[PDB]
Write an enzyme that holds these catalytic residues in place. Structure first.
Site, PDB file in Angstrom:
ATOM      1  CG  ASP A 171      -1.957  10.667  20.143  1.00 49.35           C
ATOM      2  OD1 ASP A 171      -2.512  11.758  20.415  1.00 49.35           O
ATOM      3  OD2 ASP A 171      -1.001  10.217  20.828  1.00 49.35           O
ATOM      4  CG  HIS A 176      -1.225  12.016  24.275  1.00 58.04           C
ATOM      5  ND1 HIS A 176      -0.467  11.533  23.231  1.00 58.04           N
ATOM      6  CD2 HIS A 176      -0.357  12.290  25.283  1.00 58.04           C
ATOM      7  CE1 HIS A 176       0.810  11.560  23.574  1.00 58.04           C
ATOM      8  NE2 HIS A 176       0.902  11.993  24.820  1.00 58.04           N
ATOM      9  CB  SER A 220       3.707  13.274  24.632  1.00 58.87           C
ATOM     10  OG  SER A 220       3.631  12.005  25.204  1.00 58.87           O
ATOM     11  N   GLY A 221       4.065  14.300  21.567  1.00 56.99           N
ATOM     12  CA  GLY A 221       3.715  15.383  20.632  1.00 56.99           C
ATOM     13  C   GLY A 221       4.879  15.790  19.740  1.00 56.99           C
ATOM     14  N   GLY A 274       6.880  13.404  28.555  1.00 53.21           N
ATOM     15  CA  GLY A 274       7.339  14.786  28.240  1.00 53.21           C
ATOM     16  C   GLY A 274       7.857  15.002  26.811  1.00 53.21           C
TER      17      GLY A 274
END
Ligand SMILES: COC(=O)[C@H](Cc1cccc(C(=N)N)c1)NC(=O)CNS(=O)(=O)c1ccc(C)cc1
Ligand SMILES: [Ca+2]
Length: 223
Positions: A84, A40, A177-178, A175
């Site tokens: 994801d 994402h 995320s990942g 923010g």
């Protein structure tokens, strides 16, 4: 990160910031040429920034390298967030040193109750917004399958796991995320999704990296 603490410059040396003219997601350096992040977080024109603490100040330990290729998992479903995970190849190999270091892939899935480290430059408020310039850190335990499973009105797959606190106040946020979840010295999770941040009964959901090691290894062996 809500309810966490300031990590300290370069104490999480595998932490990357993904930049498209501003920070938009985190990532984890898995070797000198490859970053793991969330699918994402996919976008064109990514510059990977390693060795960061303050993302608004050149402090002297940064390496900025352009992405040459991004590979979203072949079965990523944006509707369900299943699978994801994304790999980003660097245009040139990072120079590895104490402040820029890779994190190992796990050889087994981590256990319920294990304390993990989650990190990022995401929003630090459960209500409203404030974005930190320095890296934030949170220590939090992996939740039981049963408490993770009943943690949302949405579907939770065996490629997801929960880390955090059902009481609230401590969580990843917009923010982050990942970015990494590190448990037992290995990359066990990727910041994936949640309902708001740090809400009571609403813990963070994370891509379960242990289920992807075969695909990561295959993919980096041929790209
Ligand atoms: C996007 O705004 C947000 O504050 C959080 C961000 C986020 C990202 C990753 C992890 C966490 C976390 N707390 N561990 C939080 N996401 C959301 O709040 C999204 N939730 S949501 O309930 O708003 C929602 C639900 C379903 C769809 C299709 C879109 C949005
Ligand atoms: Ca900097």
């Amino acid at each position: 990160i809500v309810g966490g603490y300031t990590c300290g410059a370069n104490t999480v040396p595998y932490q990357v910031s993904l930049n498209s003219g501003y920070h938009f997601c985190g990532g984890s350096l898995i070797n000198s040429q490859w970053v793991v992040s969330a699918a994402h977080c996919y976008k064109s024109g990514i510059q990977v920034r390693l060795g960061e603490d303050n993302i608004n100040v050149v402090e002297g330990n940064e390496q900025f390298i352009s992405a040459s290729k991004s590979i979203v998992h072949p079965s990523y479903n944006s509707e369900t967030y299943n699978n994801d995970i994304m790999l980003i190849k660097l245009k040139s190999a990072a120079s590895l040193x104490s402040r820029v270091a890779s994190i190992s892939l796990p050889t087994s899935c981590a256990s319920a109750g294990t304390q993990c480290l989650i990190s990022g430059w995401g929003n630090t408020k459960s209500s409203g917004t404030s974005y930190p310039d320095v890296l934030k850190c949170l220590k939090a335990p992996i939740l039981s399958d049963s408490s993770c499973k009943s943690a949302s009105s949405f579907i939770i797959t065996s490629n997801m796991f929960c880390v955090g606190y059902l009481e609230g106040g401590k969580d990843a946020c917009q923010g982050d995320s990942g970015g990494p979840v590190v448990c037992s010295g290995k990359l066990q999770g990727i910041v994936s999704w949640g309902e708001g941040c740090a809400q009571k009964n609403k813990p963070g959901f994370y891509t379960k990296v242990c289920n992807y090691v075969s695909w990561i290894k295959q993919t980096i062996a041929s790209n």
